[PDB]
C-alpha cells in the first residue's frame, strides 16, 4: 500500500535521528500512524525493514551510476564514472547508512554486509567489469580487475569520506573536477601500456 | 607540581566520551577532577581549549609511532614500513573515539574539527610528503606534488579498510595486511618509478 512508504520514511527519520537499535518497532508504528499488527504484517521484523531501505537505496544509487562505455573513450568513461560515483557521496545515504550501522558496533553482521555488498562492493564490480573490456582491448595492463576498479575509486575518492564526517568538505563543482584529474592522471600513469 | 592539568585532562576527556562535547560542562569537569572553578579556568580559558589540548596532544602521540622513513633501507622496505604503521592506526581503531567525538557535534565546532585534521591526518601526509621529496631528488620516484604523492600512497594503501573496519567486517591477519600494503605499493610504484 501507500502506508508502506509512510513507514520506510517514518523509520529512515527515525534511524538517523537515534540509531537502529535506540528504536523500536513501537516507536516506528507511531510516528508511521498505523498498529503493530500491520506494521509487522509488512515487515517481519525492525531487521527486514532496514533491509529493504537498504537494498531500495542501493539499487537506486546503482542505476544512476553510467555503465561505462570503451565506445565513449577510456578517460571520458572512468571521468563521468568517476563524477557519478563522487555525487553520490556527497548527496546520498551512503554516509549516513555507515554511521547508522557503525554505531551498532558490529551487532548486526548479516545488515552490515548486505549494505556492502549492494552498495560498495557493486560499484567495484560494475567498474570492474569495464576494466576488463578495456583490459582486453589492450588499452590497460594490471593483474585483478577488482583491484584495479578498487585502486581507482581509492585515488578519486581520497580523504573525502573523512573530510565529509568531520564537516570539512565543502565542495564546487570545479574542485570536484580536479579531484577527479588528479585521481585519473594517476590511474592511468600506472595502467597504461609503454 | 601544578600537573593537576593532566588530572583534569583524563578527567574531561572520561565525559566527553561518555557524554559528548556540548552536554558536558567545565562544572562537571571540575567536579570530577576535584578542583575549584578558579583553578580550571586559571589553566584553561574555556572547554574548547581545554579540548583543543587533548586534540594536539593524541595527535603528538600518533605520530611519534609512526618511523620516519629512511631511503638507505631502500625505497619499498621504507614505505613498506611506514604503510605497515599507518594501517595500525586503523586497525587498532586508535582515531575512533576523536572522530565520533568531533562527528556527534554536527559541525558545530569547525575549529575544532580542522584542528584534529591538521594535527594528524595532514600531518601524516605531511610527513611521507618530506620522505616523498627525498626519493624524487635521488631519482627514484617522480611526480609533480610531493603532497598529492603522498596523500595518493595512503589513499591506496588504506583504499577501503576503514570502512570495512567501521561495519565491522575486518579482522585482519599480518599476511593480510601485508597482501594490502603490498598491492597498494606495487600501484604506487608502477605510477611513480621510471619506466
Ligand atoms: O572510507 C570510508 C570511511 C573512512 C573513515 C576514516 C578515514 O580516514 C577514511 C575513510 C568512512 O565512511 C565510508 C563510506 C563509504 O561508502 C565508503 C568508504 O570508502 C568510507
Redesign the interface.
Known amino acids: 500500500g501507500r502506508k508502506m512508504d509512510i513507514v520506510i520514511r517514518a523509520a529512515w527519520q527515525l534511524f538517523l535521528e537515534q540509531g537502529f537499535s535506540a528504536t523500536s518497532m513501537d516507536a516506528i508504528a507511531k510516528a508511521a500512524g498505523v498498529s503493530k499488527a500491520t506494521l509487522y504484517a509488512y515487515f517481519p521484523s525492525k531487521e527486514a525493514l532496514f533491509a529493504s531501505l537498504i537494498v531500495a537505496e542501493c539499487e537506486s544509487l546503482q542505476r544512476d551510476l553510467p555503465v561505462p562505455k570503451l565506445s565513449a573513450g577510456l578517460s571520458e568513461a572512468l571521468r563521468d564514472f568517476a563524477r557519478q560515483y563522487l555525487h553520490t557521496f556527497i548527496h546520498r545515504k551512503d554516509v549516513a547508512f ?2 547508522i ?2 554505531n ?3 551487532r548486526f ?1 548479516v545488515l ?2 548486505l ?2 555488498e549492494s552498495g ?1 562492493e557493486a560499484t567495484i564490480r560494475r567498474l570492474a567489469q569495464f576494466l576488463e573490456e578495456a583490459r582486453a582491448a589492450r588499452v590497460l595492463e594490471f593483474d585483478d580487475p577488482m ?1 584495479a576498479a ?2 581507482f575509486l ?2 578519486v ?3 573525502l ?3 565529509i ?4 568538505s565543502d565542495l564546487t563543482e570545479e574542485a570536484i573536477e580536479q579531484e577527479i584529474e ?2 585519473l592522471k ?2 592511468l ?3 597504461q601500456p609503454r
Do not use: D, M, T, W
Open positions: 555507515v554511521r550501522i557503525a551498532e558496533s558490529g553482521p552490515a554486509r549494505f556492502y560498495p583491484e578498487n585502486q581509492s585515488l575518492r581520497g580523504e569520506p573523512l573530510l564526517v568531520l564537516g570539512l588528479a585521481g594517476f590511474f600513469k600506472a595502467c
